[PDB]
Amino acid sequence: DARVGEIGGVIQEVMESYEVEINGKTYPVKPIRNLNGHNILPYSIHGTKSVPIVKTHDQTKMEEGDVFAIETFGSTGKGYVIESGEVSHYALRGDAPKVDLRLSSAKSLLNVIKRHFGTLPFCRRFLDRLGQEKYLLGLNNLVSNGIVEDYPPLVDEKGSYTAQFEHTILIRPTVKEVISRGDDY
Amino acid sequence: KVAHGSLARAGKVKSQTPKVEKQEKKKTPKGRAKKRLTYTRRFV
Amino acid sequence: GGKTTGFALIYDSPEALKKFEPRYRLVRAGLAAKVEKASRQQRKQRKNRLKTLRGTAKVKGAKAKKEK
Amino acid sequence: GGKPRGLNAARKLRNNRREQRWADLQYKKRALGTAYKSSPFGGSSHAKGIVLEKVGVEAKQPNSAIRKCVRVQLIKNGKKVTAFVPNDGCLNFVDENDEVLLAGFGRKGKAKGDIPGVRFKVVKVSGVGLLALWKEKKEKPR
Amino acid sequence: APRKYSKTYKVPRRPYEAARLDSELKLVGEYGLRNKREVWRVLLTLSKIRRAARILLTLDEKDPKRLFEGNALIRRLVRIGVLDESRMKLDYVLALKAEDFLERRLQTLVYKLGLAKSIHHARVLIRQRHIRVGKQIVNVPSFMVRLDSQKHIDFALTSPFGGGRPGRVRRKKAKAAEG
RNA sequence: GUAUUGGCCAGCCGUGGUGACAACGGGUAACGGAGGGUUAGGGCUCGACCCCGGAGAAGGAGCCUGAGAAACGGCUACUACAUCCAAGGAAGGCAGCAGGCGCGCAAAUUACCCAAUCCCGACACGGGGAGGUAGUGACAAUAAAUACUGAUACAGGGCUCUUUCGGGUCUUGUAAUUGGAAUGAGUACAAUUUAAAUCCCUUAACGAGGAACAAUUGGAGGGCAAGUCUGGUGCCAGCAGCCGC
Incomplete structure (x- = not known):
């Protein structure tokens, strides 16, 4: 029965009460407003629900049986990230449209991905260890055709510092179980 | 072009540019005095 | 500068002065005292209140005993 | 050559100028008042609207870029138009349902540059002013 | 409706002309003006005289x-001193130029009669509040001094x-050094 | 019948009146004029708005008093809004001055006064949100702060003696040195201003040495005046009225 938009406001108010001196200048810590946690589904890292880290009017409620990844990010910069840099991360869309590919090279990679990774995310090095050496043409073609999604690195402004903490929690029928808790954090 | 594009890349260059500060310099005369200095350089 | 310009009035007799001078000038010289009155809005408000009474408006408490 | 030149032919000369004056394009649009009728703005300079979504528009043939326009519905009469957000990285300042204020490109009803089918630009967002936010002269209210 | 206003300058049509840009700057530096506006103001008041003379000449x-307006126009220019007595003709006012007006202003007259470096x-x-003309203290640099009043400028x-x-500061130094 | 003329109206009798020299009808983001803006001459465009004339007081009609009204800070009735109630009843019209809501890109104080210009009444004496004064106010227009000046050195320009690092003479410049006087931006005893105040104008005691008593807005390929210098990005991000990068 907790309201996700109200949770976001509480998270923001605690973090924003802190400040940090770097090279003689004091910087307020700002939430990265366009990042959020999410629910987790079988074999699929992102579901349909979001957990913001600023106050919003999202009234969607958490329900018995759900599992959520609660993650927060703080920054000394603008509190906003953009995509920039070399791409390493990819994932096959489960809802990919049916397409016909003239290039035979793509036809082979598509079979490899479904049979090895399914909808689980993969990286370039996971292809190298399977003996794939001439795949960059086909991978870029699968992205352009809407079959594979790319996830470029996300960066704040140069000279800023960012930190992250995240846990997985199970909303069981009886009690809440914070499954990833350890003695470290 | 099903992809159409991606709006994430807005503001890439301005964000990643290095930041450098103003360095203090002497104040310049203003008003009638500033015109007097200009006249001397261009004709004397 | 060190120059100043004004206006002057010379009267035949002291009694003739008080007859023709405006009152506000007399207060400046101290000959006459100021008039004490209430502000302009309260006087206007009182005037309109008395248009609803007919005859001997000074005392109107005779109607207090109608309720018993 | 071929005009009437007599001393009592003032009627023909006056009538002729009135008829041929319609062939002008600048005068024809002024007399019929097309701006009052067809233009999304009611013959005014600015207008207020509500942002609906963020859209990217491709540049024309020689160029190659994404122009990052936006969709807006006018409060005054409920019409829907598209507007361009100037400067570098300014879409980041605008969210959904933000009450923007618009103006023209100055080409007087025609598209400017390589951007196709766009006639308006965003001047203010949340009543703060776009350019002031860009130079960090003000902070956007929540 | 009951209030009257006017503006005393005009703006040139071409903003960046090399020939015009340096010509005005020479005039500004010579007479120690503040900006280009005082140059344009002198040009406008000179243009009004030319138009009146040109209308009368035809x-x-x-x-x-x-005769009536021509004599009045000539007498006014002689009185202020921007036109010499040897030439009282309606044709000679057309030959007047900008530098003639700038000579007869209080800022330059202070220079010519000593009193300044x-x-x-x-x-x-x-x-x-130092310069005075006759008996009146003047703090307007563009006073446009008349002819017969030229021999009364003094501290x-x-x-x-x-x-x-x-x-202010001399008294403090004398008092501070005294005690 | 009306204050009077009149197809203004009642009877009886004729068949006429306007039009291609634009009648009749439809549009007007239309009150008319004196006039505003822009200029070789000829013109184009705007005019709700301080002066003159006309109309209206939420929409229509009717009427009393009176020299003068088809009046609305006068009355009667219907339509549309809307107020108090003991449930029987009673009352209202800001396109008058302030003020609130809505509409929009778009427009100020619920302040002081009859001292001035004038009006009305039985009246030299009373009244006037007509009208005047102040607050907010970068609508426009006028005047004009942000610094001034010696000496010693160096540099160069002007002239001479003139052989060259040589000397006399004046100006200009200073990450060069020290040396002078002056002024209001503020501020504050007084007087003056004013119906009572404020501002302006005068005036004792204070008020300039840099990190101030610190000027900004747009530009540097061409049209169009001002770099082919140094980092970042790599048809991406973006600039560009136009040719373009």
Whole structure:
């Protein structure tokens, strides 16, 4: 029965009460407003629900049986990230449209991905260890055709510092179980 | 072009540019005095 | 500068002065005292209140005993 | 050559100028008042609207870029138009349902540059002013 | 409806012309003006005179309108001193130029009659309450001094240079050193 | 019948009146004029708005008093809004001055006064949100702060003696040195201003040495005046009225 938009406001108010001196200048810590946690589904890292880290009017409620990844990010910069840099991360869309590919090279990679990774995310090095050496043409073609999604690195402004903490929690029928808790954090 | 594009890349260059500060310099005369200095350089 | 310009009035007799001078000038010289009155809005408000009474408006408490 | 030149032919000369004056394009649009009728703005300079979504528009043939326009519905009469957000990285300042204020490109009803089918630009967002936010002269209210 | 206003300058049509840009700057530096506006203002008041003379010149000779207004126009220019007595003719006012008007202003007249070392020193003395014409204290640099009043410019009676008492900082130094 | 003329109206009798020299009808983001803006001459465009004339007081009609009204800070009735109630009843019209809501890109104080210009009444004496004064106010227009000046050195320009690092003479410049006087931006005893105040104008005691008593807005390929210098990005991000990068 907790309201996700109200949770976001509480998270923001605690973090924003802190400040940090770097090279003689004091910087307020700002939430990265366009990042959020999410629910987790079988074999699929992102579901349909979001957990913001600023106050919003999202009234969607958490329900018995759900599992959520609660993650927060703080920054000394603008509190906003953009995509920039070399791409390493990819994932096959489960809802990919049916397409016909003239290039035979793509036809082979598509079979490899479904049979090895399914909808689980993969990286370039996971292809190298399977003996794939001439795949960059086909991978870029699968992205352009809407079959594979790319996830470029996300960066704040140069000279800023960012930190992250995240846990997985199970909303069981009886009690809440914070499954990833350890003695470290 | 099903992809159409991606709006994430807005503001890439301005964000990643290095930041450098103003360095203090002497104040310049203003008003009638500033015109007097200009006249001397261009004709004397 | 060190120059100043004004206006002057010379009267035949002291009694003739008080007859023709405006009152506000007399207060400046101290000959006459100021008039004490209430502000302009309260006087206007009182005037309109008395248009609803007919005859001997000074005392109107005779109607207090109608309720018993 | 071929005009009437007599001393009592003032009627023909006056009538002729009135008829041929319609062939002008600048005068024809002024007399019929097309701006009052067809233009999304009611013959005014600015207008207020509500942002609906963020859209990217491709540049024309020689160029190659994404122009990052936006969709807006006018409060005054409920019409829907598209507007361009100037400067570098300014879409980041605008969210959904933000009450923007618009103006023209100055080409007087025609598209400017390589951007196709766009006639308006965003001047203010949340009543703060776009350019002031860009130079960090003000902070956007929540 | 009951209030009257007017503006005293005009703006040139072409903004960036090399020939015009340096010509005005020479005039500005010579007379120690503040900006280009005072140059344009002098040009406008000179243009009004030319238009009036040009209108009258196309009239017939000995026309009563030409005689009455022509004489009044000529007398005004002689009185202020921007036109010499050897040339009282309606044709000679057309030959007047900009530098003639700038000669007969209080800022330059201070320079010519001693009283100052630089033309920039004259202006700061005018704005401060030092110079007086006749018996009246003047703090307007563009006073446009008349002819017969030229022999009465002198220091103010209350100014430290023309009498009075020592100024603000001189008194403090004398008092501080005294005790 | 009306204050009077009149197809203004009642009877009886004729068949006429306007039009291609634009009648009749439809549009007007239309009150008319004196006039505003822009200029070789000829013109184009705007005019709700301080002066003159006309109309209206939420929409229509009717009427009393009176010299003068088809009046609305006068009355009667219907339509549309809307107020108090003991449930029987009673009352209202800001396109008058302030003020609130809505509409929009778009427009100020619920302040002081009859001292001035004038009006009305039985009246030299009373009244006037007509009208005047102040607050907010970068609508426009006028005047004009942000610094001034010596000496010693160096540099160069002007002239001479003139052989060259040589000497006399003046100006200009200073990450060169020290040396001078002056002024209001503020501020504050007084007087003056004013119906009572404020501002302006005068005036004792204070008020300039740099990290101030610190000027900004747009530009540097061409049209169009001002770099082919140094980092970042790599048809991406973006600039560009136009040719373009």
